Design a protein around this ligand. Structure first.
Ligand SMILES: Cc1cc2nc3c(=O)[nH]c(=O)nc-3n(C[C@H](O)[C@H](O)[C@H](O)COP(=O)(O)OP(=O)(O)OC[C@H]3O[C@@H](n4cnc5c(N)ncnc54)[C@H](O)[C@@H]3O)c2cc1C
Ligand SMILES: Cc1cc2nc3c(=O)[nH]c(=O)nc-3n(C[C@H](O)[C@H](O)[C@H](O)COP(=O)(O)OP(=O)(O)OC[C@H]3O[C@@H](n4cnc5c(N)ncnc54)[C@H](O)[C@@H]3O)c2cc1C
Ligand SMILES: NC(=O)c1ccc[n+]([C@@H]2O[C@H](COP(=O)([O-])OP(=O)(O)OC[C@H]3O[C@@H](n4cnc5c(N)ncnc54)[C@H](OP(=O)(O)O)[C@@H]3O)[C@@H](O)[C@H]2O)c1
Ligand SMILES: NC(=O)c1ccc[n+]([C@@H]2O[C@H](COP(=O)([O-])OP(=O)(O)OC[C@H]3O[C@@H](n4cnc5c(N)ncnc54)[C@H](OP(=O)(O)O)[C@@H]3O)[C@@H](O)[C@H]2O)c1
Lengths: 444, 442
């Protein structure tokens, strides 16, 4: 009899819609659910959008994915327990597919039934306050340029945290004559063919963007790190150096003495958790990390147990962790799972936060999120999936990347759901210039 | 004894701060004024910012100007009546200065007294409702990432309307192997040297972005128009063609059949009046036009006479029109100017809107905004300035542009404030690669 709002229809919002659909299909009555999505269609980050900055309605563009993007982790690590790769594709496919393939899989899971009709598209939530036991929500109908309002018993926030970029200033940028952009702006790497590219950062975006620039013909790619190099085996035309000091006209000067002519600077400097549409009292505030505090089981807002955040952690696991989070949130909403005492909640948060702060390397992090996700898995009825296999997969994958960053996407992993072994793709990733699902799924 | 909020510290916000300063210097008591500015410094669009999109705080970047930008109208048409070019610069200088020079002029006017201390920078107004005879305003202290709140008797919205881009989709963009950007994203034309540039639009941004790209070595520049070409005398390697149909790889295809190699598409397609920080009941909704309705004298919000908008009209006049609006707004706030009846307000709006809807060419438009500005001028005490001369200047300028779009900036105009005749700059604009204030001053 309650009414539930979901903000965002990407993997997380879809996860919980799907979780609810499971109950409805079994004949259980479920709450009225309204899902708000600022994009014109579902899929979240998995939708490619040529647009950058802000859209035709002045709404910031949430899309960060670029042309030629391929899965950067084993697809087997992100398989849906309730909708296997085998079921969706009707056959085994390689472990690292291009974006369109995974998008098709994501949307395939939810496109059979009534989920889509629950989503309001081109609709942007803009204000949220909790009053008299309800979330009062204002949202802009963008096409009509009109503010609407409604009231909900539960609010699920699933707006991700890789859309609003963090963009630091470096000396000399105000006089730089080339392009300065953030990875969030990166669209078609062909833009930089024949150009000298600087990328700043040391995580997945710096890694992949640098590779894409080289793959699509950049004259050179120079990666600057502040703390430690990524240290991967970069191919010719790429180097990694310590810390941009300044841009001096067309010249990038680093603290280790390196000087490099630069045509473009790409800041792969991460993203903000950004919730302008939430009251200060409801608003999660954190940097990107495996376990922000104030989130019971990493989902329930400590100070308001009817506000639930999905997907807000930094990510090794993704789709099936979102699922475990969503099933949990569903069950909290349905009063299947009961909230422990304030003291126990706080103690449990501190237990995980304390573990999280001591993590020293990717192996410990993988183990951490594995245990986090498995604990969630055990408190609801999300179907069988082998998180122990996924643990090993992630570790093997990390070793592949250090072995050879160019070929890790050529490796094969087994499904933690069906056991199916992924075949080796008909094209090595380092040579695969065509990123279409058609080219991928069909014979060479 | 009232309290006044101003949103924005560009030319318009500075205009009204300056207007209040004039009274304060004379010894008149003025209301407490708080000015909110999302940038870290004052100057509005006249500040160059390398940033695009949104800033380190996730706040959309309001800056739209690029490097090596030169003023595109005669400076004499935008001179401050209360702070002349001669006074600020101490000598006559050419009529079309680089951005920094006019920025220096704008900030010079307000730099001498206590105005800057009234401004909160890195502060973004986010919510506004009118309740119990007051504007309740929420603003983000961006550095601290904290929402703050205050209440004001009067609210002046001076946030411009050339910051939030209107960005239309064309077929083929989803697969175009090159950059697609809006003019709002344009920063340094050198980015596009040796490139085949497509520019879409038919107004000032299209015009200047096209010329800038050509000036800075674009391999070619092709301008698409939807309705009518600008029709200027474009140099070798530039053309205007009708209506983009689709991009097909590195190829722009127009409805008039032309196929053009395209490396970058620059949408010079205008901007939104965008006021997410205002309650629906307070929010001006309009396209870019010389006289939007619901604004008495183009300033006072018809449904709330304590809400005043500045600079929201499309613009031939700029600085001194903002001044005339600001002086008016100030006098309304100070209760020196009294609001006529609801029916007289409605009639007055209808009178101007009806004239505005009938304007058919730049000459009629220049005449219209001249009369709009002069009427404003006559109801407050903004100092003497020759709007009749300005009217003539604009028309002459329009003729220069049609005669030769490459040399209109090499022309001289006389000050409507002091009569000083501007020297012709020592370098024709086309070869003017040194846009430094130093080099411009002599
Ligand atoms: C460049 C890049 C590459 C990646 N590659 C991979 C990969 O290969 N494999 C992998 O497993 N993971 C990858 N990820 C991780 C990615 O975060 C997750 O796969 C997934 O997209 C997270 O889903 P989400 O629903 O939590 O957030 P999102 O996917 O960001 O979805 C959030 C949705 O909420 C909407 N929204 C936001 N604000 C509002 C509002 N105010 N009102 C209404 N709607 C709103 C947005 O439009 C968006 O659709 C990648 C991330 C990035 C940035
Ligand atoms: C590319 C370009 C070139 C131009 N060239 C010329 C020229 O050569 N000559 C000429 O006369 N005119 C020119 N103009 C016209 C220009 O509009 C005016 O010169 C002038 O900048 C308008 O001033 P304004 O104060 O009304 O708005 P702006 O200059 O835009 O100032 C608005 C200010 O409000 C701030 N703001 C916005 N939203 C918020 C918020 N929510 N909270 C707090 N602060 C906020 C912004 O940071 C900004 O500083 C040009 C415009 C553009 C876009
Ligand atoms: N191939 C793909 O499919 C693909 C491609 C791109 C992104 N992604 C996804 O995108 C998500 C986000 O990854 P991300 O790397 O964008 O964000 P991130 O993991 O949060 O990393 C942010 C990076 O920015 C650096 N940084 C922070 N401040 C800086 C400054 N002032 N100057 C220079 N560097 C600075 C940080 O390193 P220091 O603090 O040491 O400088 C850090 O390496 C990931 O989930 C990833 O899976 C996937
Ligand atoms: N040198 C300089 O100092 C300089 C340089 C650039 C800009 N500026 C300033 O910028 C300000 C604003 O000018 P502006 O031209 O950006 O905005 P504008 O004057 O509002 O013009 C918007 C243009 O976009 C076109 N347009 C609208 N929808 C379109 C679509 N779907 N596809 C293609 N075109 C479309 C319009 O023509 P159609 O509707 O006919 O297509 C119109 O020509 C001016 O005040 C000017 O002073 C100054």
């Amino acid at each position: 009899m309650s009414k539930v709002a979901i903000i965002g229809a990407g993997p997380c919002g879809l996860s919980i819609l799907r979780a609810f659909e499971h109950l409805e299909k079994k004949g259980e009555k479920i709450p009225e659910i309204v899902c708000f999505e600022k994009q014109e269609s579902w899929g979240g980050l998995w939708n490619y959008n040529w647009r950058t900055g802000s859209d035709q309605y002045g709404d910031p563009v949430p899309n960060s994915m670029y042309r030629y993007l391929w899965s950067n982790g084993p697809k087997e690590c992100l398989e849906f327990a309730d909708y296997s790769f085998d079921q969706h594709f009707g056959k085994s496919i390689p472990s690292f597919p291009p974006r369109e393939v995974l998008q098709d899989y994501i949307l395939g899971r939810v496109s059979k039934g009534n989920i889509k009709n629950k989503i309001k598209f081109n609709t942007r939530v803009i204000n949220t306050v909790y009053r008299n036991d309800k979330f009062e929500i204002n949202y802009q109908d963008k096409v009509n340029d009109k503010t609407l309002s409604d009231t909900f018993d539960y609010l699920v926030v699933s707006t991700g945290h890789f859309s609003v970029p963090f963009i630091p200033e470096y000396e000399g940028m105000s006089s730089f004559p080339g392009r300065i952009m953030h990875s969030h702006d990166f669209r078609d790497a062909e833009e930089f063919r024949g150009k000298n590219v600087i990328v700043l950062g040391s995580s997945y975006s710096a890694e992949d963007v640098a590779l894409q620039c080289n793959k699509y013909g950049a004259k050179s790619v120079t990666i600057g790190y502040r703390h430690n190099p990524m240290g991967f085996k970069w191919p010719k035309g790429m180097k990694e150096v310590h810390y941009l000091d300044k841009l001096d006209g067309k010249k990038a000067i680093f603290k280790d003495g390196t000087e490099q002519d630069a045509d473009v600077v790409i800041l792969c400097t991460g993203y903000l958790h950004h919730f302008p549409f939430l009251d200060e009292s409801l608003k999660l505030k954190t940097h990107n990390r495996l376990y922000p505090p104030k989130l019971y089981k990493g989902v329930v807002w400590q100070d308001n147990h009817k506000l639930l955040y999905l997907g807000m952690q930094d990510q090794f696991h993704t789709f099936n962790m979102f699922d475990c989070q969503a099933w949990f949130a569903r069950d909290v909403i349905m009063d299947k799972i009961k909230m422990p005492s304030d003291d126990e909640i706080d103690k449990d948060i501190n237990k995980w936060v304390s573990m999280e702060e001591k993590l020293e390397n990717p192996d410990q992090m993988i183990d951490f999120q594995t245990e986090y996700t498995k604990e969630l898995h055990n408190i609801s009825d999300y179907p069988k999936i082998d998180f122990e296999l996924i643990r090993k997969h992630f570790k093997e994958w990390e070793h592949h990347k250090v072995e050879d960053i160019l070929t890790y996407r050529n490796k094969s992993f087994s499904s933690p759901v069906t056991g199916s072994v992924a075949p080796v793709h008909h094209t090595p990733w380092e040579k695969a210039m065509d990123d279409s699902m058609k080219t991928f799924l069909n014979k060479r």
